[PDB]
Amino acid sequence: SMSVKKPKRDDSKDLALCSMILTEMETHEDAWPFLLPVNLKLVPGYKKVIKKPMDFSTIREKLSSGQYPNLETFALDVRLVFDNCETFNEDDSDIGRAGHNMRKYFEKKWTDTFK
C-alpha cells in the first residue's frame, strides 16, 4: 500500500532472458506452424473464429520495440499462440501435436529460468 512495499525483485535481466527463451522456441523443429501469422485470406474460418491471432514473429517484433511492460504480458502472448492452436486444430494432427509439444517446452524453460 502507500509507502509500504515488498522487497524489490531484480527484473533488469528479464528482457534478455525472454529473448533467449524466444530464440529457443524459434529454433525448435516443431515451431513451423507458429513462425508467421496465419494467412487470413487463405485459411477459411480463421479470421472469424480466432479473435486474437498471435505468432512468434509478432512476439519478436513486440519484444524488440518495448511493447511488453513486464515478463507476464510476454508469457500471455506465448500461451495465446498455443491456445489458438488448440482452438483450431485437432489434437491428433501434426499441427495439434506440435502445439502441445511447444507449450510443454516453453513451460519448462519458463519455470527453470524464473521460478
Question: Distance from CA of residue 56 to its chain's centroid?
Answer: 7
Query: In whole angstroms, what is the distance from residue 17 CA to residue 41 CA?
Result: 35
Residue with cell 492452436: 85
Contact 30/48 with Cβ under 8 angstroms?
no
Contact 85/99 with Cβ under 8 angstroms?
yes
Query: Helix, strand, or coil here: 48?
Result: helix
Count other Cβ atoms within 10 Å, centred on residue 100. 14
Residue with cell 511488453: 68
Query: In whole angstroms, what is the distance from residue 102 CA to residue 25 CA?
Result: 7
Rounded-to-10 torsion of CA 115, 83, 89, 93: 0
CATH 1.20.920.10 fits 1-115, yes or no: yes
Residue spans of the domains in the chain: they are 1-115
Q: What is the resolution of this structure in A?
A: 1.8
